[PDB]
Design an enzyme around this catalytic site. Sequence first.
Site, PDB file in Angstrom:
ATOM      1  N   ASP A  76       8.815  42.449  29.242  1.00 53.39           N
ATOM      2  CA  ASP A  76       8.540  41.115  29.775  1.00 53.39           C
ATOM      3  C   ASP A  76       7.741  40.238  28.810  1.00 53.39           C
ATOM      4  O   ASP A  76       7.192  40.720  27.824  1.00 53.39           O
ATOM      5  CB  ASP A  76       7.836  41.197  31.128  1.00 53.39           C
TER       6      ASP A  76
HETATM    7  C1  LIG Z   1     -13.350  35.729  30.609  1.00 50.80           C
HETATM    8  C2  LIG Z   1     -12.090  35.216  31.301  1.00 50.80           C
HETATM    9  C3  LIG Z   1     -12.331  34.164  32.402  1.00 50.80           C
HETATM   10  C4  LIG Z   1     -11.466  34.348  33.673  1.00 50.80           C
HETATM   11  C5  LIG Z   1     -10.097  33.611  33.655  1.00 50.80           C
HETATM   12  C6  LIG Z   1      -9.486  33.268  35.044  1.00 50.80           C
HETATM   13  C7  LIG Z   1      -7.929  33.183  35.098  1.00 50.80           C
HETATM   14  C8  LIG Z   1      -7.272  33.430  36.494  1.00 50.80           C
HETATM   15  C9  LIG Z   1      -6.936  34.918  36.848  1.00 50.80           C
HETATM   16  C10 LIG Z   1      -5.583  35.138  37.587  1.00 50.80           C
HETATM   17  C11 LIG Z   1      -4.323  34.537  36.908  1.00 50.80           C
HETATM   18  C12 LIG Z   1      -3.426  33.681  37.815  1.00 50.80           C
HETATM   19  O1  LIG Z   1      -3.874  33.073  38.750  1.00 50.80           O
HETATM   20  S1  LIG Z   1      -1.615  33.599  37.445  1.00 50.80           S
HETATM   21  C13 LIG Z   1      -0.905  31.854  37.489  1.00 50.80           C
HETATM   22  C14 LIG Z   1      -0.403  31.433  38.890  1.00 50.80           C
HETATM   23  N1  LIG Z   1       1.043  31.151  39.011  1.00 50.80           N
HETATM   24  C15 LIG Z   1       2.081  31.990  38.584  1.00 50.80           C
HETATM   25  O2  LIG Z   1       1.795  33.063  38.054  1.00 50.80           O
HETATM   26  C16 LIG Z   1       3.530  31.540  38.792  1.00 50.80           C
HETATM   27  C17 LIG Z   1       4.644  32.594  38.527  1.00 50.80           C
HETATM   28  N2  LIG Z   1       4.782  32.912  37.099  1.00 50.80           N
HETATM   29  C18 LIG Z   1       6.014  33.230  36.501  1.00 50.80           C
HETATM   30  O3  LIG Z   1       6.983  33.222  37.250  1.00 50.80           O
HETATM   31  C19 LIG Z   1       6.114  33.555  34.971  1.00 50.80           C
HETATM   32  O4  LIG Z   1       7.316  34.235  34.837  1.00 50.80           O
HETATM   33  C20 LIG Z   1       4.967  34.451  34.414  1.00 50.80           C
HETATM   34  C21 LIG Z   1       4.164  35.072  35.548  1.00 50.80           C
HETATM   35  C22 LIG Z   1       4.083  33.563  33.563  1.00 50.80           C
HETATM   36  C23 LIG Z   1       5.532  35.650  33.501  1.00 50.80           C
HETATM   37  O5  LIG Z   1       6.522  35.237  32.718  1.00 50.80           O
HETATM   38  P1  LIG Z   1       7.437  36.416  31.633  1.00 50.80           P
HETATM   39  O6  LIG Z   1       7.116  37.711  32.337  1.00 50.80           O
HETATM   40  O7  LIG Z   1       8.834  35.880  31.784  1.00 50.80           O
HETATM   41  O8  LIG Z   1       6.796  36.240  30.276  1.00 50.80           O
END
Ligand SMILES: CCCCCCCCCCCC(=O)SCCNC(=O)CCNC(=O)[C@H](O)C(C)(C)COP(=O)(O)O
Lengths: 52, 175, 606, 459, 56, 88
Positions: F43
């Site tokens: 992925d």
């Molecule tokens: C020290 C660090 C500080 C903390 C940072 C905080 C960050 C937030 C933590 C949680 C992360 C989120 O919310 S996650 C963001 C919220 N929305 C989504 O995930 C929508 C669905 N994504 C997809 O469909 C894509 O395919 C994808 C998943 C990109 C993969 O793609 P490949 O597989 O085709 O590469």
Amino acid sequence: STFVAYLPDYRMQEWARREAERLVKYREANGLPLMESNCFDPNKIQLPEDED
Amino acid sequence: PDSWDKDVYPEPPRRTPAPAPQTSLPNPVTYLTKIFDLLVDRPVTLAREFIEQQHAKNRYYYYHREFRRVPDITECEEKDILCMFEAEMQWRRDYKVDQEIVNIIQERLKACQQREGESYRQNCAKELEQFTQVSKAFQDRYSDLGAHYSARKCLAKQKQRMLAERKAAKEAAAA
Amino acid sequence: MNPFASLTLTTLTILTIPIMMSNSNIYKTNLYPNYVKTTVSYAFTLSLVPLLMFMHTGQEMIISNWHWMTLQTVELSLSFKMDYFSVMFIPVALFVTWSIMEFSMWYMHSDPFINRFFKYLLLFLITMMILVTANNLFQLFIGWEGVGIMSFLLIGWWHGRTDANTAALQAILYNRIGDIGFVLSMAWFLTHSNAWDLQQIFMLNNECPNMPLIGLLLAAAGKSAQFGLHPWLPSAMEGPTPVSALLHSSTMVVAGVFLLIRFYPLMETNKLVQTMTLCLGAITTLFTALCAITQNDIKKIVAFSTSSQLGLMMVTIGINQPHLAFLHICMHAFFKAMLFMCSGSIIHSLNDEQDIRKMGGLYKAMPFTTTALIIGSLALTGMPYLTGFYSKDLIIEAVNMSYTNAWALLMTLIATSLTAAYSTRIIFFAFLGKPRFPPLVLINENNPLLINSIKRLLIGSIFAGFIISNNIPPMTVPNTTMPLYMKMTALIVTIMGFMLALELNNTTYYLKFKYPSQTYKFSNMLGYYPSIMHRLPTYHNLSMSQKSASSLLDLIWLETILPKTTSFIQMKMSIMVSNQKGLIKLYFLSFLITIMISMTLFNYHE
Amino acid sequence: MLKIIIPTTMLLPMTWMSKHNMIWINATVHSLLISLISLSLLNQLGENSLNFSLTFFSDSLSAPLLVLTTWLLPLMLMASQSHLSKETTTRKKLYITMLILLQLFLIMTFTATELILFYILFEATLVPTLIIITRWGNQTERLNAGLYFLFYTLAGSLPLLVALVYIQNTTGSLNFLIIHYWSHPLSNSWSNIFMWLACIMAFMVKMPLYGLHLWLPKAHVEAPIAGSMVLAAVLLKLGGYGMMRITTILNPLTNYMAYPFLMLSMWGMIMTSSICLRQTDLKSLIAYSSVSHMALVIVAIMIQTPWSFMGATALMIAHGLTSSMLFCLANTNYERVHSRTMILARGLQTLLPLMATWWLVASLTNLALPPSINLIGELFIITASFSWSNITIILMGMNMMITALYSLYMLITTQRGKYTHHINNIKPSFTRENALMALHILPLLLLTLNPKMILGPLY
Amino acid sequence: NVLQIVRDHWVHILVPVGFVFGCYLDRRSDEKLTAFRNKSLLFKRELRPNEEVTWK
Amino acid sequence: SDAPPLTLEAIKDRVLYVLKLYDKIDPEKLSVNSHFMKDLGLDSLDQVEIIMAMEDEFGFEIPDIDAEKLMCPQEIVDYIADKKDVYE
Ligand SMILES: CCCCCCCCCCCC(=O)SCCNC(=O)CCNC(=O)[C@H](O)C(C)(C)COP(=O)(O)O
Ligand SMILES: CCCCCCCCCCCCCCCCCC(=O)OC[C@H](COP(=O)([O-])OCC(O)COP(=O)([O-])OC[C@@H](COC(=O)CCCCCCCCCCCCCCCCC)OC(=O)CCCCCCCCCCCCCCCCC)OC(=O)CCCCCCCCCCCCCCCCC
Ligand SMILES: CCCCCCCCCCCCCCCCC[C@@H](O)O[C@H](CO[C@H](O)CCCCCCCCCCCCCCC)COP(=O)(O)OCC[N+](C)(C)C
Ligand SMILES: CCCCCCCCCCCCCCCCC[C@@H](O)O[C@H](CO[C@H](O)CCCCCCCCCCCCCCC)COP(=O)(O)OCC[N+](C)(C)C
Ligand SMILES: CCCCCCCC/C=C\CCCCCCCC(=O)O[C@H](COC(=O)CCCCCCC/C=C/CCCCCCCC)COP(=O)(O)OCCN
């Protein structure tokens, strides 16, 4: 630059140092003050008549 | 050295303590001083004495210039330009000489401060006192003339000071 | 003639010979850096002799050799002061410079301009000697500005890098702010005392007023990077590591403390200036140490350490112990230079990495570097009987046994604890644990230049305190009577800092992740001082220099009042005068009006 | 004194009778020899001036100015012969004639005994300068610049003439020796106030004083290289020399009439120094640094003390040399890239290593690094100003801080960073340019060993 | 062959002789300001038994 | 002196070493020209971790726009060689 460096002492700095040494020697032996407050003698000055 | 007059640039008689070693360890300063004398000072004195023999073969003299005394600005008439010129030149020469007198006194003061070490505040009272008087007289004579000074402005300053002194003396006599 | 004057003058004179050969066929040869290093070593050996003379008989001297010019009653001549401070500081600086040049022969080996680098280092050393031995204020200013220009040229050594140029100009700016105070002191001393030389100034100022001393203190704050003008020293690590080891850690940055030491007879008499100096030193030594304990670049940590030690020197000056401050200057030079050398060795062995987060277990991979850095940190922390101990531990007692500002005393003790804290941080994150650097290991410290240069300073860091302390005459009254809890306070607070920092560092091994405190953000981002003071004043000044000074005034209103108004008025008058249609009926009637006016206005009153 | 004037006059027929390809060689050699002859005037007395004749005299104030004036002509000829290559023979000779006439007028101006003759020569210096600017300048603004140069000066000096012939009608003479010896105080009256203004504003416009300095950023920028060199090095110092000469008659009126000018100078120092921080034109930055430096000379002359006069003389000489060198340094880059924008050509230290060293030394002297005579003059003026009022240290200190900022900025923009990629016509430095820089910088450094030669009659 | 040098290098003597002439014109000027030669109160002096003027 | 003159074969060896140390990709199957998506079924999120691992291995940072494209070990080797000026 060489010509300017060896210019003769027309500014009379060494001369002034020698004269100052002479008068300091003379005055100290005499016991007279090293320097005088008034450059021009009082006797040759004619102040106006009176203070009022 | 005979270069300068010792009466105008005096110094104390230079009391130096005799070396009185207590330990048996060798003194490195003595060994280094012997090395310096044998390797540095002796060639320097040899070269200097050669230079002096070369100088003694040619002897010539230069003479300090003597200047006559001319009438001062007080004796000059209002618009007599030639007497004013001579009086002003003599006044400028006297000003330079006074500057150098203050310079000599300041050199005495500095040398005393360095020489006396930690006891300068007490052992340099005479030099500080001489400088205070010379400085007061020089300040009375030439202070505040500004750029474009002259013998006329100095005479006006002196006359103003004598008028102030006369008024102050008349004020005291009335008490 | 006794050899004291000749040897003191020759020591400085021979340092200039490799500069006169900068156009010879040695400067284009790869043997020039070794030539410069050999010259500095010979100069150190020669300077060891006048120091022996002083330790034997306390011999001191001033040499006014060349009369430069005379202005009225003021005479300015080239004069050197060869007192205790000069003849003691010259050999220490020469020893450190010799070690650092031998180190730079290895650290900067692949630089295409290493010859230029060596001449630049030599130029700085010459200017520092001029600063240190100066007997009048003008010669002191010559050395003062020379060391600043050399610092500018060496900070921005890699002149294609924008950050290095920014840091060099920042150093110049922050030092000109204190140059203002230097010039104020010069003007005051010339008018009031009628001299620039030290002897006259000492005589004529029995009870010195505030203004010259405040000017001197501003200059010292600028040069030594105290709290008001502190941020330039940490940014000065843009320069190559040997530049940090020589100029910005041990030799150039102590110039402000040296200036205030040179004028200690006048500062003995002004209580307000001593209080200001003590408070400035206390806030500096606490703030910089507080910033140091959370830094990740190793050079930044050592830079904040040296800024905190300079604050401690300023505190020692503020309690009327100038000789103790000078002794701490001489002691701090050894182990601070060697700490910067060890940091440079780590950086070079790790392919120019300076973050401690990528230095793992180097305790066994670089054994000699580990030994040298451990001994240096122990010397810096006031470990008993080391070089650091013969000054710093005497300072802490002196503050404890003085009529002192209470907040300053508390700040000094807390800073003493934080020193051990950040030494612990360096050792823990750089030498303990497991490797965190890239897998292609390049670690190699088996160069004789590196080993010998570090070892020479390592021996100093151990024995110099005892050697120097037992050969200088007593220049103060000792504190023979202390409460026991006040005698052991420096060690107690150092050990407390050691334990607390080590425990908080071992806490990082646990498998917990939490967001940082606001206090951690304040410490790591340097009290937000650069983020505010390098953005708000610069923006406002640079905005006014264009919006009003150039545009509103110069390009608009100054044009409008004098030339544009004149041109407009003359154009209007020309159009009015010349717009006559050429009909004689109009201007002959004009003639009639003119004739009538003349007969009555000028004729009817004669 | 004719032993300098007459050889200078012989430069005209020599130039006009030379071969088409020998004018530069002959002019350079013989102007250098005239400088050598001019060096003899530095032997000055401590009490009065060198009174050659009823017409010409030399003092410790005018001798260094004369030496700088004669020394500047060979440098101008060296700097001019590159961009005048395609010029016809007769126009080259006309340009050299303009330079020779300018030198002749300046030499007589600095040594005239009588103030009306001084005025006539000091005004005659306008014609060659204006012709140079408006005939050999490169852009269309050079015409306007010329007008600004012409009418700012004249509007100041036309009252001065009216004052001078007025003074001779009441005191009987305009001879400077007689004026100095027979000096009398100026009363406190409206007529005396306007006579004071008429004697001062002409020189103030030449300095120039902040507020009437607009003509300078135009004239210096649009002029050819020799025009800007002579405008900065010598023509600005005419105001300082004239103010120093004419101040004797002014007292005691100067104590209160100097306040507006002291305020204008002490604030315009900051204003122009800060203007230099945001300047897209390099030659314009160099021009504004001159106003910032001459504000200090104005302050020194207005406060009327021996230390201030010494400082003003030293600063005038040092600024002449440094500003001429900076204008030449900018012209070297202009003749490569044909633009005066400072950020157009960057990283030049990589491509021109020795010219970078020249740039560094010029910038160091511009910010008055000790022990350069720039610093000597600046520090003397600052000490005298501190005596005049302690608060001045704040303004003076601020100016020093700003001057270092725009100097090194000028250095960092043009020499450091990375060279612009597109430019590819940056040729190696010629021997002519390197020698032109050396002949600017070496005398400056050499004057440090004998500063009494440039400290004026108050030493 | 002398003309091949002189006819194109004579402009090289204009400024030298212009210097020499200048010096001459100074000396003649000094001959018009001798009203106080050996007459000032500071330098008035008895002439040496052979000399005629104290300066030229 | 400083770091040895790193060559093309060394870059390839280190890239394949790092890949073979990844648990997701088996050593026998992996080939220099193997696509990370078609060949290994990886992925987009997984790919980002490989790029970061290569950065940690060679000690330099690859920009995100440049990084996304690299789908084969040969592509990574060519990118690193282009950055470090490696011609054998
Ligand atoms: C020290 C660090 C500080 C903390 C940072 C905080 C960050 C937030 C933590 C949680 C992360 C989120 O919310 S996650 C963001 C919220 N929305 C989504 O995930 C929508 C669905 N994504 C997809 O469909 C894509 O395919 C994808 C998943 C990109 C993969 O793609 P490949 O597989 O085709 O590469
Ligand atoms: C012997 C006699 C005397 C005995 C005294 C009693 C015994 C000791 C008493 C306790 C002393 C303190 C001991 C713990 C220190 C704190 C360490 C810690 O864990 O920090 C937690 C936390 C930060 O942790 P984090 O963010 O989670 O860290 C994330 C990771 O760890 C990030 O990891 P990292 O890798 O970035 O590491 C972070 C870093 C550390 O992380 C930090 O950056 C924060 C550390 C701050 C420590 C500050 C201590 C000294 C402060 C002096 C300040 C003076 C007053 C300033 C007030 C300013 C107000 C505006 O870790 C270290 O490197 C080690 C830290 C230092 C340890 C050793 C400290 C020794 C000196 C202090 C003790 C002195 C003892 C001798 C005294 C003798 C006197 C005679 O900071 C705190 O909460 C406490 C800090 C201490 C001061 C806080 C005060 C509150 C501030 C706001 C108050 C309200 C103000 C209202 C407005 C008023 C306006 C007028
Ligand atoms: C490329 C490599 C660079 C480095 C290698 C170079 C090697 C070293 C060479 C540099 C020498 C360093 C200088 C050290 C100082 C010694 C020189 C000093 O002794 O000379 C001074 C002398 O200097 C001169 O006085 C100053 C020269 C004047 C400069 C005039 C420039 C020439 C005219 C050019 C026109 C420019 C216009 C100027 C407008 C005013 C001392 O003055 P003074 O105290 O008395 O002498 C006492 C004895 N006397 C009186 C009997 C003579
Ligand atoms: C941008 C660059 C321009 C150049 C700057 C030039 C600056 C010129 C300023 C001249 C300095 C002073 C001029 C006259 C001295 C005092 C002026 C007045 O303000 O003071 C009072 C003067 O009194 C009244 O105020 C009269 C003056 C009021 C009318 C004049 C208008 C001034 C407004 C400012 C105009 C802007 C000047 C520049 C024009 C372009 C003093 O009180 P007083 O005791 O009674 O008079 C004593 C004077 N005595 C001895 C001659 C009798
Ligand atoms: C680039 C712009 C520069 C501007 C410079 C212009 C300002 C020059 C100063 C005024 C010039 C005229 C002064 C006249 C010359 C003085 C000679 C003199 O002493 O005469 C006065 C007379 O003084 C005057 O008449 C002058 C009055 C003003 C007339 C012209 C007005 C000009 C504008 C005045 C204000 C502007 C000056 C400052 C502006 C600065 C520049 C912006 C007294 O003589 P008596 O009549 O015999 O008195 C004793 C026996 N009764």
